């Protein structure tokens, strides 16, 4: 492993949890500027999920339920469902602040092993990931 | 152009019901009140304001199911590092949309579809 100080190694990649809190977009931007090719962490298998889970518990002591993943729906609209019950397109919406939940986070009640979608503008801790060179 | 008990707006008919039902039960009830009647969709501020005014007349606690079941149906989940989405551990119980009428504001929020809320029906005249 050649991960720089502060970063932890796992299967050809480097990881580091950051006690934020930051929004999803600010966390992702923070990750790209912390190392070349950095992003919010991605999960490809259960082993990587277990490593990131324990990494969060040992390096992030936050009272939040959520730690940001790199997964989200990228659209500008505030929900996914394209149609009402009657088939008409969903266009006009009036979500109370916090009700639009298009970004995925690790959830504490699953020991940060599974995901839950929450408000992209909510500020949470996060985990960055980048391939070392 | 609306039958007795229903209020007219923009070629459509509306009726707010006070009985507390879960979303499925409310949608079933609407379907039985008139041809083409379902839980109301809301397509504009003016339509929302009209429906909110009906609720203030009928309901003491002015929260109503809307015709949206599961806001997160058919999401397109992508990783910011552009890796392919194969491993997936996101599951979520069904949430359904409630229109909350406050004296100062109207807003929507999502509740478990199994909860019991008043509701509003709507069909095209």
Numbering used by the authors:
A (entry chain A): 2 to 134
B (entry chain B): 0 to 124
Task: Give sentences copied directly from the paper behind this entry.
In this study, we demonstrated the isolation, purification, and characterization of a novel snake venom protein with anti-angiogenic and anti-inflammatory activity, ZK002. In the first part of this paper, we described the isolation and purification of ZK002 and its identification as a 30 kDa heterodimer of α and β peptide chains of the snaclec class of proteins. Snaclecs are approximately 30 kDa in mass with heterodimeric structures comprised of homologous α and β subunits linked by a disulfide bond. Our results showed that ZK002 exhibited potent anti-angiogenic activity, with inhibition of tube formation, cell migration, and cell invasion in VEGF-induced HUVECs, and significant anti-angiogenic activity in multiple in vivo models.
